[PDB]
Amino acid sequence: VERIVSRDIARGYERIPIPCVNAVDSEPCPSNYKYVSQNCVTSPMNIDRNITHLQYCVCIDDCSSSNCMCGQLSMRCWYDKDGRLLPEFNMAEPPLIFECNHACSCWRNCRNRVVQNGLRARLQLYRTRDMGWGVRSLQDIPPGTFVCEYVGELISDSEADVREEDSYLFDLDNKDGEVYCIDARFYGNVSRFINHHCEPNLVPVRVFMAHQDLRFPRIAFFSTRLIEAGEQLGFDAGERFWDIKGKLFSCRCGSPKCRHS
């Protein structure tokens, strides 16, 4: 039998509530982290927010033409009129997306603004049978839809390397040198609870909105296919996750094509 153990894990910070339910055991809503709806820092990250450093468009329309500078930075604007990724979008190898920003000449409702409008989908935190908490969708989500952002505490690679709890670390860049990470252990949103799946229905895309400091992309999950009402959300956590974790437990995503069990 299912119990609703919180009407909203976000305490009103999202556009809609994200309830938590438990149909498995007697655990209450998890409370050992702080829910935040946008990234935070502890130690300063010094993200470059110089407004004169932004590249911006001068569009006189709704940014649906191929002249839009911000589309050009994105290679093209990938959003259709309903804010979903075009079928031509390369989900195997996503480009960087540059949405419009407060320096652009366009209006706040232009075509090229999706991730900046925040989480819209009806999601639910729930107790899985054997993977702790997971996140499901309460409604059908068409392909190419923005589902949620991986939100947390922005930290250096160095600091990430000594965090004892590494279940919630997300690298922002795969290169060496000056690189950064989101840790959603202590501060995070609903995305911290998404489990790994070997055939995922979400893909992470790097996005720039209010600043274009390439050291700090924001991580936006889009649906890779129709996700049906009730389905668990999953993304591929990748080799830099399983190279560590696979020595501790195997994957329980249950996919017939599972690669980590």
Partner: peptide, 9 residues
Amino acid sequence: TKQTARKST
């Protein structure tokens, strides 16, 4: 490697 597990895009 790195010392801690990281998700990567």
